[PDB]
Design a protein around this motif. Structure first.
Motif, PDB file in Angstrom:
ATOM      1  N   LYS A 159       4.369   0.627   8.144  1.00 58.21           N
ATOM      2  CA  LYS A 159       4.646   0.766   6.718  1.00 58.21           C
ATOM      3  C   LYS A 159       3.401   1.205   5.958  1.00 58.21           C
ATOM      4  N   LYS A 176       3.075   4.802   6.506  1.00 57.22           N
ATOM      5  CA  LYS A 176       4.055   5.457   5.648  1.00 57.22           C
ATOM      6  C   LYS A 176       3.639   5.383   4.184  1.00 57.22           C
ATOM      7  N   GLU A 224       0.872   7.892   3.638  1.00 62.61           N
ATOM      8  CA  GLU A 224       1.436   9.227   3.477  1.00 62.61           C
ATOM      9  C   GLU A 224       2.058   9.394   2.096  1.00 62.61           C
TER      10      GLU A 224
END
Lengths: 53, 236
Positions: A43, A46, A49
């Motif tokens: 996570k 993510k 990103e």
């Protein structure tokens, strides 16, 4: 009897091993925390990103 | 025989008054059993009739705690089986036969409300066990396992105390004492196999120590019962 008492001690050792099985699960719970951290790490990657975007 | 008949007549006359009968009921708990045994042994119609009248007077509704006295007599002295045996037997005297029939009816009515649990409780209180049908009945043990463990395993504690007393009395090693010890060991084994929670209570109360001590008993039956209990405890 003495033999039965020794068998009970073996059962007690198995009961201790049964308690150690929970400790083994507790030892495996350390990997679960690492696995949970890995889930958060995925996570975080993510999120990183998303943060980059 | 004449002295016994006169004593029975005097006892019946005293028991005619409900207060005196109630007082004498608690004076000797085994008096009813002794009277029943004497009536069964004696063949005289008058003596049997006097004994039946004396027994009925103690359990008569006029005397205080008539139901409790009748239940206690049936549980301890086996009044119901003796009355049933007397009813089957033929008596020449008509009054004696009528008294025996009335006593049998009263005993049957008292036993109708009572159950095997009451008999087991009475046996435990009297500390006398001679391999009763409930001990060898698997269904009775299965349906009374919860009752034994009830009230913080009060029945289990009583059984452990009885076993400890038998172990203390094991030095005499009497036949009745040996039978009681074997019955207690069987009951402990049953209460350990079913409702295993009682095993910890028995171990805390020295039940395991009592079983181990009984394992060295000279009597073969007592030693076998103790070995079976030990096997049910931790053995195969």
């Amino acid at each position: 009897n003495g033999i039965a008492t020794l068998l009970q001690a073996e059962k007690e050792a198995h009961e201790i091993v049964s308690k150690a099985r929970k400790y083994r699960q507790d030892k495996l719970k350390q990997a679960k925390t690492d696995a949970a951290k890995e889930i958060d790490s995925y996570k975080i990657q993510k999120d990183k990103e998303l943060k980059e975007f | 025989i004449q002295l016994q008949y006169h004593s029975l007549l005097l006892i019946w006359l005293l028991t005619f008054n409900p207060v005196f009968a109630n007082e004498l009921v608690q004076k000797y708990l085994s008096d009813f059993l002794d009277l029943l045994k004497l009536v069964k042994i004696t063949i005289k119609e008058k003596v049997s009739r006097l004994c039946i009248s004396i027994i009925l007077q103690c359990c008569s509704t006029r005397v205080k705690q008539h139901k409790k006295v009748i239940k206690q007599l049936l549980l301890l002295g086996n009044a119901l089986p003796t009355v049933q045996s007397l009813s089957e037997r033929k008596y020449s005297d008509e009054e004696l036969r009528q008294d025996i029939s009335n006593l049998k009816e009263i005993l049957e009515n008292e036993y109708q409300e009572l159950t095997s649990f009451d008999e087991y409780v009475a046996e435990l209180d009297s500390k006398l066990l001679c391999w009763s049908p409930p001990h060898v009945d698997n269904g009775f043990w299965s349906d009374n396992i919860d009752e034994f463990k009830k009230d913080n395993y009060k029945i289990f504690r009583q059984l452990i105390e009885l076993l400890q007393a038998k172990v203390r009395n094991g030095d005499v090693n009497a036949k009745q004492e040996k039978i009681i010890i074997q019955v207690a060991l069987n009951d402990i084994t049953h209460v350990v196999e079913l409702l295993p929670e009682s095993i910890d209570v028995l171990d805390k109360t020295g039940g395991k120590a009592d079983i181990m001590e009984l394992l060295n008993h000279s009597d073969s039956r007592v030693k076998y019962e103790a070995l079976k209990a030990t096997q049910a405890i931790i053995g195969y």
